[PDB]
Design a protein around this nucleic acid. Sequence first.
RNA 1: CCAUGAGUGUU
RNA 2: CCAUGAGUGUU
RNA 3: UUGUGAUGAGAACACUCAUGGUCUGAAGAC
RNA 4: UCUUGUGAUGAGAACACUCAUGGUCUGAAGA
Lengths: 227, 227, 122, 122, 375, 375
Amino acid sequence: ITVKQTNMENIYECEFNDGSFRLCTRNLVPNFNVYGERLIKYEGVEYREWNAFRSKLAGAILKGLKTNPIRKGTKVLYLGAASGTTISHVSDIIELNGKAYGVEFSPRVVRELLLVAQRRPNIFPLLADARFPQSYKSVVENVDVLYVDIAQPDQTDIAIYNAKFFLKVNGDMLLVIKARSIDVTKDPKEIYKTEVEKLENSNFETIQIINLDPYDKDHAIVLSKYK
Amino acid sequence: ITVKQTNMENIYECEFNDGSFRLCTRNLVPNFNVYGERLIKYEGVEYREWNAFRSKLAGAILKGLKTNPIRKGTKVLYLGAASGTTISHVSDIIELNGKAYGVEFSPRVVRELLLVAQRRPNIFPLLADARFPQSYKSVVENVDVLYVDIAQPDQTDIAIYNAKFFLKVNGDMLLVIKARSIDVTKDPKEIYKTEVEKLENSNFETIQIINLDPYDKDHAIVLSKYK
Amino acid sequence: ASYVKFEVPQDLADKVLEAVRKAKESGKIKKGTNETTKAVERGQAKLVIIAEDVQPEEIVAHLPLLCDEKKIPYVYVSSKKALGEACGLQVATASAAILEPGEAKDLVDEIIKRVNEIKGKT
Amino acid sequence: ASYVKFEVPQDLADKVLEAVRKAKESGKIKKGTNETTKAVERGQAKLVIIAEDVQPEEIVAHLPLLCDEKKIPYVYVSSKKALGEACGLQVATASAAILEPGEAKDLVDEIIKRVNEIKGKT
Amino acid sequence: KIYLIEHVIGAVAYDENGNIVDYITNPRDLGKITEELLNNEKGIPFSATVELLKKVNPQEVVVENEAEVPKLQALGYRVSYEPYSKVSRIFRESLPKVAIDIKFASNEEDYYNFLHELSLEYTRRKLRSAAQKRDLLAIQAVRAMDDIDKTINLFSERLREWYSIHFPELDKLIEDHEEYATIVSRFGDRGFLTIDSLKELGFNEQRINRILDAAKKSIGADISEDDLSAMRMIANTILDLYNIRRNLNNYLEGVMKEVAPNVTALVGPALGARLLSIAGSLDELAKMPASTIQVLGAEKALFRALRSGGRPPKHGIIFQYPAIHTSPRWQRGKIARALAAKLAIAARVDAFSGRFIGDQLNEQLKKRIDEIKEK
Amino acid sequence: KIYLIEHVIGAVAYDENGNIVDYITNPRDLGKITEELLNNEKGIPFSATVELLKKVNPQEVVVENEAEVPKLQALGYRVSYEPYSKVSRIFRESLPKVAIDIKFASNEEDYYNFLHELSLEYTRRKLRSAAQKRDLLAIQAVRAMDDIDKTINLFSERLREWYSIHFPELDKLIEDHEEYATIVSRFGDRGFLTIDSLKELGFNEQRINRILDAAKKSIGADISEDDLSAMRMIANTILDLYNIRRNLNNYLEGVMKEVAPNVTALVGPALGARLLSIAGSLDELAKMPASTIQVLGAEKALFRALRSGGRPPKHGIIFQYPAIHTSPRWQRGKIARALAAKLAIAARVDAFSGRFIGDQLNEQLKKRIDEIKEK
RNA sequence: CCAUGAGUGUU
RNA sequence: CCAUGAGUGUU
RNA sequence: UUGUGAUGAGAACACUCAUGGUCUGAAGAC
RNA sequence: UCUUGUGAUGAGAACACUCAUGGUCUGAAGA
Ligand SMILES: Nc1ncnc2c1ncn2[C@@H]1O[C@H](CSCC[C@H](N)C(=O)O)[C@@H](O)[C@H]1O
Ligand SMILES: Nc1ncnc2c1ncn2[C@@H]1O[C@H](CSCC[C@H](N)C(=O)O)[C@@H](O)[C@H]1O
């Protein structure tokens, strides 16, 4: 075992007892885990294992994500917080100075997101419809990074509307493109192309495009800067 | 509605009230049905609707079996009688003067074949393994037709062993080739080919080969004469 | 009436009916509440037209919410027979939508911009 | 022993042990009760050899039944170590089979023809 | 012209360049800020905002939210709204700070500490309302009712295979599961079957004769009491489950008449509940086209079709409507299309008013079915 | 040289050309012919054959059945056998008729009527023998026991979703389904939860405090007694089903030690029945190679493997053996191969003798497991 | 039926 | 998992 | 240690919930 | 003339299950 910092802030690697390598983050609330992940102590510090098959964000990294706009003290808008798997790791990364605004419209699942956010002052859960940003307008601020992981056929259009409300100009958007929630008929490569184009016509500048296969089938993630 | 004889003895067709055409046989035990089949009266005669999707023999006819060695008064050995669906129709065809000897080794299903055989003096159920013809040797006679429909990987060889016990010389064998019970890996066409080779090296003279699709997938049926 | 969100002056209501008529010919439209609904849900509609004289009222009560989710503009007209017969039908139609304006582009653009004002938008 | 159906003269048992050896080099054989079993169920085997001194007895008790269903002839020998080392192993093998005789075809044909006699077949 | 902003922080008035013309700080209180946010959803202006509109006496105000516009017009002002305005962006760009400046909190430390405990309460509050919706009770209950059905079939299928070891002939004689189970439960060993005891269970004589005669000539195995009691455990459960099911049905009809009477009127409580279940809620169902309602529950067929350009399903869970699965096949497509249609209407009126038209909706429907059957 | 033919009809002696040297007709009695046929399976000659072999006094006789020869040698005769001999073929060629000649039946009319009613009695008799096999009882119980496992899980998953409308937090607090069901069953409304009643069910205090605190601060919906009663219906059923499961288990272990003790010794009663279940019978199991036992219950993975040339499954139903699903994956393939191997032996000794060696079998296995675990 | 997220049973 | 044969549930 | 089975096998089975993907579109009958 | 965008026409694909029979890994090397 060994833990070591990486090319990206507050993100670490583990050499393991057997020779396997996993991403992990510096746990903001020691001795607690949000999903099932392994808790690990090294040099008296507690790290949380970051499963790449579960978190789209960690997936993108190992699949060669260039630049990671989510760092220390970053203010981030999270569309689709769900149970809180990924957002808990962006919580560990932005670290109290930063803020994570988590928007999620499913009561069954906000129920569990609640539990994650109580433990973390970093996270502000918002039971709201991401199609009406006017509904959480009155609670949030504007943000540096806009992370969007919603299953909606019009997700990209939803992402854009949320940007021109809250994305600081020259800020970044991470957009997860869910091809099979956009149209199960169409081929995912076509879907990727038509969606990135929607983005470029709303003057987002395509920085990188990752295919999350095999971590997530028929998914891609887009990094871009809003102008 | 109208019933008419066909090119094969005791097998008839129905014109129907709407325009559908179905095979049927002359019911040997009136006002009784063995599976769910329709009972229909025409010129005061009761016929049993013969479903081709359920019975391979009726299936074969519709897929163009030139000649039917199973006719009036035929003595036929039936390997694999099951619940009694097909054999009850060959009962209707061979007609009291004929005999149908039904070999089947699964108790759960002979359980119901029994019920078919009580109503028909025509049929002799034999709870026995077709791999050991010696076990029913002592009850049956020699026969004109050898009908074989068993799921066993060595089905063809079973059929042959049974022939040189009970098949009259210059008699006929109807063999159902169940490709997916011989080898699910291999191609069904390969199987059809290699198995008929077994027949010819055992001096059966291949008369006809029918493919039962769409009545039954991955099945072919062989008519041949024993020498 | 109760699913009627704002008030359309009849000059506007007629400006619409013509945009619809120009759209049948040179462009693409959908007619009938069910097809209109699929058109909004699929994000195809550029304008959804709802008639004011529909009964029971609820048959179209959902179209304003659907249009608010997809940020698609909607307008009212007085007669379901007017609109139905506008659409090229000989029966009434409770709602419809323009998917492709064609040679009504300028006409539809002036409509969404005048209904935006009576709705109070800057 | 109880799974041993008939009596093998050791002249025969020796004729066999050699027929196995001739088949390893020029033909194909399977060695071991499990491979022997699969060889029978698959109808690959032309001859199944069972050792007479196997313990526990039941380990090969099924091969006669299996051989009778699939009509493959079987023979016994005295030592499993004889057979095992016959097979080209340095351990014992409780059973084995010839799939392809090679240059033992003739040697095997006489074997199937002598065991048919002591078994009482005309 | 003054651009108005409504926030947790309070109410702030802006000039068109982005300078605070004036402000009114919100009370630093969880209870009240929650209530005002909940009300601002309905459009109700902050009481901190009404106060600010008195300090300044502005000719033109513009709010962020369009549901606010009508409420403030009735208050005397000339109002419009501008979404994602430059002004509102500016405000939020300055939002770590202007929380301190207008003196709502002493530092960044407990602006964010307060805001955090507010967001937990705001969403705790919404979470509780959603849970309070009556249709959820209907949906879970029919889902449980379906699971009980599933299970009754599974155990019945098991029991017949098991009990048929002792008494095989009985299987094809008693077609009904609840029946088959009563006999196994109450008699057990086939030698206990009597004319009388069987007559006490409402079996007619010609059936009783066929059973007893079957039981005597039975080719089943003799089997110990220990073996039979094992069976009868399963047999008694099937009986227990039939009762639990009947109770759930009654419960369902109850809830269902409250929450969607128009839908119940057309298709019955259980089928109505099933549709809610697939839709998720009455409100989702009410937003659906009939062409969707017609195929809800037939997604396997539907998407193999849309994927391959093949033939779509004529009916989904709606197939359960007796008029559809009873009729000949060439009628079903037409009857389904009609059912879906009326359901779409029925769903909307339950959702948006609660007014009842279930009687005529049913009657209209039964006309259309008659025309079809007359062809 | 005399060819002997044994048939329903009686016993006939033939010369090599095919002429009846002599014959002895069987009595026209169903009961007696049945018993002789059943016994002829074991090799026993018809008593009609012994009578005939005294009348003719032949030097070399040849029978149809190879199981008959030693029985007749032990009676003093020189015997061999010929399968599908011309004579036996010849005999059956003339079989409608020779029933009349040797005067067993007067005409075809009641040769065939007798033969027909013989066959019904012969196979009715065999059918009854099959039903009487002890492992069938084993097989059905473990199948029912699994249906209950499935159903318990199914209702528990439903109940938690349902009960969570009223008390969502309880879901993540009570991990055990039988526990959760108990709380819902006895208390119902969360306001009825007290320290004492919870303690009387054996909850430790650090937990009792956590439930009550959660219940007090709960964001769940208020709900009628009617609503709770529907839920508690499912809750009590889960509890009922748990007791039936425990019961069936006892029944199972009992039968399983009787019918296959060597197998129970290795894998326990249930996994043993399950292997019986998938195989069909103990005798089907006993004929299997270890390489098959190892993958029983994993046909889905397996036939995708054999079809595509991909990787075959390491374990089928055998995966359920604690030593396999508990150990790290790199050991599993080996432990399974070991288990399959020992199981194949165990089944053969269970089927072919009944001799008990499950202890040396278990012990050999735990040795091989230890060697593996030390790597 | 597909994709994603959180889970359960034999254990 | 595939094929065949007999069936069940919502009905 | 091992044909009474070494080695390989990145495919034991059975389920739940959440979110999204959810037909056609003007003609038919006498 | 009648029904019909408040939905005609088409739709050779409502969903969930049970049993019976067959197809059921490798093959000599490892620390
Ligand atoms: N319109 C909408 N508003 C808010 N959330 C939405 C939404 N549409 C879909 N979602 C949410 O999008 C989520 C998709 S799964 C995304 C999970 C999360 N980002 C993670 O990586 O762990 C669901 O929880 C769903 O509730
Ligand atoms: N060795 C064997 N001896 C006798 N029957 C066998 C057998 N192997 C398989 N079978 C039987 O072959 C049957 C295949 S299903 C055949 C269907 C039937 N002939 C009909 O059309 O009505 C099974 O019921 C099985 O019991």
